[PDB]
Amino acid sequence: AGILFEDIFDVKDIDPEGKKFDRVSRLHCESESFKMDLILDVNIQIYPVDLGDKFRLVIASTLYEDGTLDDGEYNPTDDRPSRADQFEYVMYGKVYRIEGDETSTEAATRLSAYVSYGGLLMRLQGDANNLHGFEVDSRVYLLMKKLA
Amino acid sequence: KTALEMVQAAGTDRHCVTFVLHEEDHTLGNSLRYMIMKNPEVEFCGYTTTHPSESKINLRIQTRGTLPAVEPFQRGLNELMNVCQHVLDKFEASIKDYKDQKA
Amino acid sequence: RITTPYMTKYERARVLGTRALQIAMCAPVMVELEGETDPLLIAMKELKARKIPIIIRRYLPDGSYEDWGVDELIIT
Amino acid sequence: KYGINDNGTTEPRVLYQLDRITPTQVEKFLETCRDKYMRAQMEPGSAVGALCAQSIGE
For every residue of B11-67, which 3-state class applies, written as one string? Answer: CCCCCEEEEEEECCCHHHHHHHHHHHCCCCCEEEEEEEECCCCCCEEEEEEEECCCC
* Cβ-based contacts of A79 with chain B (< 8 Å): none
Residues of B in contact with A77 (CB under 8 A): 40, 64
Please state, in angstroms and as integers, the Cα–Cα distance from residue B17 to each residue in A72, B5, B39, B63, following that order: 21, 7, 16, 9
Sequence spans of domains, chain A: 5-148
Over its C-alpha atoms, chain B yields an Rg (Å, rounded) of 18
Give, for B78, the enclosing helix (H) or strand (E). Answer: helix B70-102
Task: Give chain D's contact residues with A (Cβ, < 8 Å).
Answer: 1-3, 12-15, 17-18
Separation between Cα atoms, residue A125 and residue A131, nearest integer Å: 8
Q: What is the Cα gyration radius of chain C?
A: 13
Q: Which of residues 39-68 of B touch A (CB under 8 A)?
A: 40, 43, 64
**A9: which strand partners?**
A31, A55
**Listed residue (C50, C52, C48, C49) closest to C20, CA to CA:** C52
Chains D and C touch (3+ CB pairs under 8 A): yes
What pairs with residue A124 in β-bridges? A38, A113
In angstroms, the CA C56 to CA C28 distance is 20
Q: How many CB atoms lie within 10 A of CB B63?
A: 20
Terminal CA-to-CA distance of chain D, rounded, Å?
54
A75 and chain B in contact, CB less than 8 A: yes
Please list the residues that pair with A139 across neighbouring strands. A94
Among C11, C13, C76, C8, residue whose Cα is nearest residue C43: C13
On chain C, the residues whose CB falls within 8 A of the CB of D38 are 4, 6
User: Which residue out of D31, D35, D36, D38 would a mutagenesis test of the C interface target, given it has the greatest number of C Cβ atoms within 10 Å?
Assistant: D38
Q: Which of A134, A140, A135, A98 is nearest to A118 (CA)?
A: A140
**Proportion of chain C in helix, strand, coil states, percent, rounded to 5:** 35, 15, 50
Task: End-to-end CA distance of chain B: give it in Å, rounded.
Answer: 50
* CB spacing of C4 vs D44 below 8 angstroms: yes
Which chains have 3 or more CB–CB distances shorter than 8 Å to chain D?
A: A, C
Report the alpha-carbon distance of residue B68 to residue B23 in Å, rounded.
24
Burial class (CB in 10 A: 0-12, 13-18, 19+), A132: middle
CB C29 within 8 Å of CB C39: no
Closest CA to B41 of B61, B21, B20: B61
* Residue B67 exposed, middle or buried by CB count within 10 Å (0-12, 13-18, 19+): middle
User: What gap in Å lies between CA B33 and CA B29, rounded to an integer?
Assistant: 6
SS3 C74: strand
Query: Rounded to an integer, what distance in angstroms lies between the CA atom of residue C19 and that of residue C55?
Result: 12
CA distance A133 to A61: 10
Cβ-based neighbours of A79, under 8 Å, separated by 6 or more: none
The experimental resolution of this structure, in angstroms, equals 3.6
Residues A139 and A116 sit within 8 Å (Cβ to Cβ): no
Q: Residue A72 in contact with residue A78, Cβ under 8 Å?
A: no
The count of other CB atoms within 10 Å of the CB of residue A120 is 17
**CB-CB contact of C41 with C35 (8 Å):** no
**CA–CA dist C47, C53 (Å, integer):** 10
Three-class SS state of A42: strand
Sequence-distant (6+) residues with CB within 8 A of B28 are B21, B57
CA distance A54 to A46: 18
Cα-based distances in Å from A79 to A65, B59, B72: 15, 29, 21
Partners of residue D15 in chain A, C-beta under 8 Å = 128
